[PDB]
Amino acid sequence: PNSELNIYQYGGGNSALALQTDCRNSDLTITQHGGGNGADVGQGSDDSSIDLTQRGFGNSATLDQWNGKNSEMTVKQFGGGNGAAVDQTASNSSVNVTQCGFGNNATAHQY
Amino acid sequence: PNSELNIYQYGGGNSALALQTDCRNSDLTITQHGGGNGADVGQGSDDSSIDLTQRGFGNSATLDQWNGKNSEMTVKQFGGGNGAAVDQTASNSSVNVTQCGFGNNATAHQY
Amino acid sequence: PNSELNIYQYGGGNSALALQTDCRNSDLTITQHGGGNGADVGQGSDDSSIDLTQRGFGNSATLDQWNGKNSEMTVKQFGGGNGAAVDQTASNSSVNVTQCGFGNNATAHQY
Amino acid sequence: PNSELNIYQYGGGNSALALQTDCRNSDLTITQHGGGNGADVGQGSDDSSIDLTQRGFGNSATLDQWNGKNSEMTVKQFGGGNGAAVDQTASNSSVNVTQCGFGNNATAHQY
Amino acid sequence: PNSELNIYQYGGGNSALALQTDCRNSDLTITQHGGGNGADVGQGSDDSSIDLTQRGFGNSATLDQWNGKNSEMTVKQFGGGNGAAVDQTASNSSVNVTQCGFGNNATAHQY
Amino acid sequence: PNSELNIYQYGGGNSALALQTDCRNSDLTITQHGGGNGADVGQGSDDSSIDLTQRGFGNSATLDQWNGKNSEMTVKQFGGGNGAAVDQTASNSSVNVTQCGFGNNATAHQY
Amino acid sequence: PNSELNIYQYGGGNSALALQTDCRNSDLTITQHGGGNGADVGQGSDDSSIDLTQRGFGNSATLDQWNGKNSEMTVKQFGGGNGAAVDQTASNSSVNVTQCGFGNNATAHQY
Amino acid sequence: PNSELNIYQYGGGNSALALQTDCRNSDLTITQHGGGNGADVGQGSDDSSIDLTQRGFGNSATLDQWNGKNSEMTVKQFGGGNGAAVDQTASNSSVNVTQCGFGNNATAHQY
């Protein structure tokens, strides 16, 4: 059971919360480029992947993948002030979020 | 159940909210080109597809895929300020909604 | 049941409402060219087809196909301000309404 | 395998790398307060904990916990430009690093 | 094997080098007060202790405790520029170094 | 074997060399008060003690306790520039040297 | 064998050389008061005593106990430049030498 | 064998030569008052005594007591430049020499 959590933070003013529990063979990566991006990621699913990359300024993300299996979730934010929340509990399922520009709001739920 | 939810944003000021639940072997894709388009997509149908594409400005869409099976959704806006709302519950059914121009309103239902 | 609802707008200020229920293996098609054309189409007929084409300005059509089977409705306005109201319940029947010019009014009923 | 990795950055310009694999039931905690602090932490040890606290600016610590069991590693850097390098492979073992001030360099290896 | 390594540095410009390997149930403590103090301490001895206290400036002590058991090594440097070099390999043995003043040099070997 | 070696230095510039090997259940104590005191003391005798007290400045003494048993070694140098050389090898023997004043030299041998 | 050597020197420039070997339960006391007194005392006699007291300046004494038993050896030199040479081998014997003044020479042999 | 040899010199320039060998239970006493007085005394006589008293300047005495038993030897020289030569070998014998004044010469033999 290899669980991997990576937090890559470049620039100034980025802040991160990352959480894995009961998630076997799961990968969760946080990469922040720029400034002021705040991150909160929860992973509790086996054989699942969470990939959160922030490039820009002022983006905020809340990401929860629970009780799933063989699930891939991706959130990529480019630009400024974009806010994302992703909840994924479906098994063998994928959620992909990519927001480019300013002030974009995205909410994704997969059960 | 291989379920994919895709949000691709190009431009500035677009907003999207996506819902996919109890949804086996189906795809939900939201693509916006331009600015200020607003979207709300709920998909709960097995072996189904929703394709919502916005190219232009100020278009508004609401899409609901519920309790169906083997159903297809393709909803397209070209231009400005087009507003569409579609409810589809029929199985083995498809609704293909397109607007070209400005200020067009379309309502579609399938049961 | 392969049932399709189609709405196409070209121009500006056109409005179309389409409702189709209990209508199996049937097509709903609306095409509006120009501006200010208004459409209200109800389809509840099995193995039936509705084709409404408005080309021009200010044309209005109210179309209802209920309880029929193997029925076809083709309503076409060319010009300005033409008004059509057609109600069809007969099975294995076809009504074809065509208006050319300005201010034409046509009512068709088939039972 | 409840394996948790937390990294907290408050301020701007901090850099931290955290790596957890082959590491069951283990916690890796990074807390960076200020700006420009550097951290590289690798964790591959069972039932182990890593705690890193950098408070100030420009501090450096390179931290490796591999192959160990029931092992705790603590480093607390207070001030500016402080350097500590700690490798841990010993089981049931602890290393405590406490740097206060500017330009401090102290290295510990535990096997 | 509850083995603890502690370093306490107060002031600026102090350097200490500590090594604890294969070293079960043992403690290594370094306490530097002032500035520019240097210490090199290696510990490879079971159930052993190393206590080093440097208070002042420019003090240097090079300490090695290897292959011993139940061994205690104490060095206390008070003042400036003091040097003590001690190697301890004997088991159930104790070394005491006490330097007060400036430029003191005392060397101890215990086998 | 409880073998404990003590060096106490008060002032600045005092120098002392102490060596304890194969010397079981023995105490090695050196006391230097003042400045510039030089001492070389080697102890390899079981159940033996060496007590060296230098109070003043520039005192020099060489003490060797080898191969003895139940032997006590005492040297007291008070004043300045006192020089004493003592070798003790006999068992159950005591050597006592007291120097008071300046420029004293004393040699004592016990076999 | 409780055998002790005592050397007491008060002032400056006094020199005393003492050897005790093979000599059980025996005493040697050297007391030098003043300056420039020279003493050479060798003892090899069981349960024997040597008492040398030099008070003044430039006094010289050479004292030898070898192979005797129950022997007592005394010289008291008061004044300046006194010279005493005593060799003792007999058992149960005592020689008392007392020099007061300047330039005294006294030699004692007892076999 | 309590055999005790005593020299008492007062003043400056007095010289004494004394030898006591094979001489058990006998006393050797030499007393010089003044200056430049010379003494040569050899004692090898059992249970015997030699009492030599020189008071003055430049007095000379040579005394030999050999092979005798229970023999007493008295020389009292008062004044200046007195010379006495006495050989005593007889047992149970007493020789008395008394010189007062200047330049006295006394020779005594007892066999």
Residue numbers in the entry:
A (entry chain C), B (entry chain B), C (entry chain A), D (entry chain D), E (entry chain E), F (entry chain F), ...: 41 to 151
Task: Quote the study that presented this structure, word for word.
Curli, a prototypical functional amyloid formed by IDPs, serves a pivotal role in bacteria. Curli fibrils, widely expressed by Enteric bacteria like Escherichia coli and Salmonella spp., integrate into the extracellular matrix, promoting structural scaffolding, adhesion, and host colonization. The curli system consists of seven proteins encoded by two discrete operons (csgBAC and csgDEFG), which regulate the assembly of a major structural subunit, CsgA, and a minor subunit, CsgB, into curli fibrils. Using cryo-EM, we have shed the first light on the cryo-EM structure of E. coli CsgA fibrils, revealing that the amylogenic regions of CsgA adopt non-centrosymmetric beta-helical structures.
